[PDB]
């Protein structure tokens, strides 16, 4: 007295993975903005979902997409292959003050021209970290014996553009709308969307710049809290602004090294030689560290002493705060911020150095050379997160030291894709019903 | 309700908004071009692999189409009150997940016998 009825369009979904495409609204850019398509949220009731931010597949796909997009604009323009010559570098002095002598050098070298059997003796200005000496003293480039140096492309821009990794038809994206969500566990407030919000691909270590803020309190995220080898992500509830600037003019000079091959170097500086620096507010940082430690004391106890120290040592792109402002890469010491001990109008100025040979994405064999920027560089930025770590103690004291760390670019993008999940819709169903054909 | 709005309701309360989910299943060689092309190819293939299974059983253009096979008591011994008013769609597909292949096999030969029985009806 029962029969089979086939239903098409039942709300049943499985867990799967697919490929996502860009979607943005619209001098070129590094990331393809004009190649994306031009750009609803349905709340669900009586359904739960177990989210896990440490086993997501969107982070690796986003990392592979950013790597594939970074190596597509450096190809068709000029590479600086004959630059590995014997330089002759001296010191530069033009009303220069203290603590700057030794960071800039005036180099002179021979270089080929558009004719094959002729030479030309030219000169330029280089930094301290870009040249090394060999045994007037002779100098050479640092990334010459291990990597090939190509110039950064002068018709692109490194400005971050918010994009939307958006799923095709047949799949769906779920989002947990919890205000105190920690990326792991069940979520009783799940809503479906088309795709995500604007995510800016900001490349920075130890400081989450131009990110997303929280809603209620400062969030602390970690995978294994009993291990001293996992990073700790801190999400603030308020932004802390910071103003970075460089007082140098940095005029540019073009040299033709061959047929249709140009090389942009530093010319002459008109003015004083001062340090590039970032000013950060001192009154907001104290209450920011207080609101961080008030949430951090819940995972270790109410009888814990919290020490904030600087980095120990390693690579220059790990211990120092590395970021990009105005097209120029800055490396700040930032040792004056993480210096505190918490027991149960002024501004801090951090000097930053500038490097022209940048090795991105921890690669050994692919280098770059950024061109000089004309004018004065000054930018503002927000601080909406931190990447910290701790060391292994002797499990008998109550003192915990937290040091800034980074280097891995997956942690900078896992803080934005920690609430989204991709599901696959299956609309077929079979039901019992007392009905017959014809 | 919207797209997937009746996901938490019962099986009797979610069988009336089936047209909402049935209409959202179809819609230089750079990095963002091949991904869009593969996404369109995957969407077309996922639409065709369901339209073919809908067309084999004889439900071309119908969503609550009726069949002629009987329901065996060994698959589910529940009545009409504990299915359309208590269980949802996320649990009913997991309840008879071991018996879907024999139902999909029985839905083919009965349609074939019904199509070959119609040939002996207009030949009089």
């Amino acid at each position, epitope marked *: 007295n029962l029969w089979v009825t086939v239903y098409y369009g039942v709300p049943v979904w499985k867990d799967a993975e697919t490929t996502l495409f860009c979607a943005s609204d619209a001098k070129h850019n590094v990331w393809a903005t004009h190649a994306c398509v031009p750009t609803q949220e349905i709340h669900l009731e009586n359904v739960t979902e*177990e989210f*896990n931010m440490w086993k997501n597949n969107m982070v690796e796909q986003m990392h592979t997409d950013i790597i594939s997009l970074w190596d597509q604009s450096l190809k068709p323009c000029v590479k600086l292959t004959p630059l590995c010559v014997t330089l002759q570098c001296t010191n530069v002095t033009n009303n220069i003050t203290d603590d700057m002598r030794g960071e800039l050098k005036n180099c002179s070298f021979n270089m080929t021209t558009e004719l094959r059997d002729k030479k030309q003796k030219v000169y330029s200005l280089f930094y301290r970290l870009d040249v090394v000496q060999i045994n007037n003293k002779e100098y050479r480039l640092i990334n010459c014996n291990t990597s090939a140096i190509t110039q950064a492309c002068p018709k692109v821009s490194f400005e971050p553009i918010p994009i939307h990794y958006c799923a095709p038809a047949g799949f769906a994206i779920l989002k947990c709308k919890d205000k105190k969500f920690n990326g*792991t566990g069940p979520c009783p407030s799940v809503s479906t969307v088309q795709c995500t919000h604007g995510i800016k691909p900001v490349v920075s270590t130890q400081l989450l710049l131009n990110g997303s803020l929280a809603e209620e309190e400062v969030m602390i995220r970690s995978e294994n809290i009993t291990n001293n080898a996992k990073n700790i992500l801190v999400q603030f509830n308020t932004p802390v602004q910071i103003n970075c600037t460089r007082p140098n003019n940095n005029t540019r000079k073009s040299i033709r090294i061959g047929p249709g091959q140009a090389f942009y170097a530093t010319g002459d500086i008109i003015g004083d030689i001062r340090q590039a620096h970032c000013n950060v507010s001192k009154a907001t940082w104290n209450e920011t560290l207080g609101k961080v430690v008030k949430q951090l004391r819940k995972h270790f106890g109410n009888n814990t002493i919290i020490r904030f120290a600087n980095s120990s040592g390693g690579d220059l792109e790990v211990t120092t705060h590395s970021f990009n402002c105005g097209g120029e890469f800055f490396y700040c010491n930032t040792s004056g911020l993480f210096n505190s001990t918490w027991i149960s109008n002024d501004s801090i100025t951090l000097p930053c150095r500038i490097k022209q040979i940048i090795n991105m994405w921890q690669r050994i064999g692919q280098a770059m050379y950024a061109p000089p920027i004309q004018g004065v560089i000054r930018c503002v930025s927000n601080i909406t997160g931190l990447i910290l770590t701790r060391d292994g103690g002797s499990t008998n004291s109550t003192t915990e030291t937290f040091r800034p760390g980074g280097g891995d670019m997956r942690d900078n993008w896992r803080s934005e894709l920690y609430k989204y999940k991709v599901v696959k819709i299956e609309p077929l169903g079979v039901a019992p019903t007392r009905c017959k054909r014809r | 309700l919207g797209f997937l709005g009746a996901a938490g309701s019962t099986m009797g309360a979610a069988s009336m908004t089936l047209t909402v989910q049935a209409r959202n299943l179809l819609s230089k060689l750079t990095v963002w071009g091949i991904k869009q092309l593969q996404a369109r190819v995957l969407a077309v293939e996922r639409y065709l692999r369901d339209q073919q299974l809908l067309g084999i059983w004889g439900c071309s253009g119908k969503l609550i189409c009726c069949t002629n096979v009987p329901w065996n008591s060994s698959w589910s011994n529940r009545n009409l009150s504990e299915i359309w008013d208590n269980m949802t769609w996320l649990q009913w597909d997991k309840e008879i997940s*071991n018996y879907t292949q024999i139902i999909y096999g029985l839905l083919e030969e009965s349609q074939n016998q019904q199509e070959k029985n119609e040939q002996d009806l207009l030949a009089l």
Partner: antibody, heavy 132, light 108 residues
Framework: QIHLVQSGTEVKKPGSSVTVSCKAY?????????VNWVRQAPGQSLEYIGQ??????????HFRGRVLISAVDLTGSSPPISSLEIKNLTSDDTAVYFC??????????????????????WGQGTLISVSA | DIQMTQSPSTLSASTGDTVRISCRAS???????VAWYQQRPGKAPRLLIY???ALLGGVPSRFRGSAAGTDFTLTIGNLQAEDFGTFYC?????????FGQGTKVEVK
């Protein structure tokens, strides 16, 4: 892998209470898992006592209002702890108690059916012998 | 409340035979919500088979399980010297769960 330890053999007098602890090593979060507590009488069959799921602890219809199950999350200097307290025990509670976990992450895993589930990982069991 | 009955109570076999253990429930479990556990005397219990006819990671392929209406059977072929213990059939369809009765396999 996932290793679980429990308490030792505790001898208790009738009239007082008892508390059995269970420490885990390897699990991530109790929101993705479920901790079930059963027992086993010597020379008899097993018996299901209680369970904690989605931060919702419950017991059976025979041990209602008698036992109490509690659990906490991760701590940077402490393992995951699941405790069970028995108050007003009788002279028929000498048994080997256990502590089981079951991963309830995947919906189509087939190891759980709407709250009641199987036992994928077992412990060592504590002997509780009560006498006057 | 479904009461499980295991068969047989106490049997014996040798190295190389096949042991068939049956389990009969009270109602008709049409969803295959049954599991087979093994417990050594003195040691900890170990889950062998979940969902009637599915193996676990680390269980050899010599064990087999089948389900038909009320009757859930378990076949153990190529019997070794380390498979002597107690076997349990436990359902988890209705609340609460109930174990079987115990089946010891000796050696003779």
């Amino acid at each position: 892998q996932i290793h679980l330890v429990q308490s030792g053999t505790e001898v208790k007098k009738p009239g007082s209470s008892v508390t059995v602890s269970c420490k885990a090593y390897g699990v991530n979060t109790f929101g993705l898992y479920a901790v079930n507590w059963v027992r086993q009488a010597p020379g008899q069959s097993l018996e299901y006592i209680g369970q904690i799921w989605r931060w919702k602890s419950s017991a059976s219809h025979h041990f209602r209002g008698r036992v109490l199950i509690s659990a906490v999350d991760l701590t940077g200097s402490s393992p995951p702890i699941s405790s069970l307290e028995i108050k007003n025990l009788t002279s028929d509670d000498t048994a080997v108690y256990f502590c089981t976990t079951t991963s309830t992450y995947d919906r189509w895993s087939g190891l759980h059916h709407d709250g009641v589930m199987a036992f994928s990982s077992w412990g060592q069991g504590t002997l509780i012998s009560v006498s006057a | 409340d479904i009461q499980m009955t295991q068969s047989p109570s106490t049997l014996s076999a040798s190295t190389g035979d096949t042991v068939r253990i049956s389990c009969r429930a009270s109602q008709s479990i049409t969803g295959n919500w049954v599991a087979w556990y093994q417990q050594r005397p003195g040691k900890a219990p170990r889950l062998l088979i979940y969902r009637g006819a599915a193996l676990l990671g680390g269980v050899p392929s010599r064990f087999r399980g089948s389900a038909a209406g009320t009757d859930f059977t378990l076949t153990i072929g190529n019997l070794q010297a380390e498979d002597f213990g107690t076997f349990y059939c436990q359902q988890y369809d209705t609340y609460p769960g109930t174990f079987g009765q115990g089946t010891k396999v000796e050696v003779k």
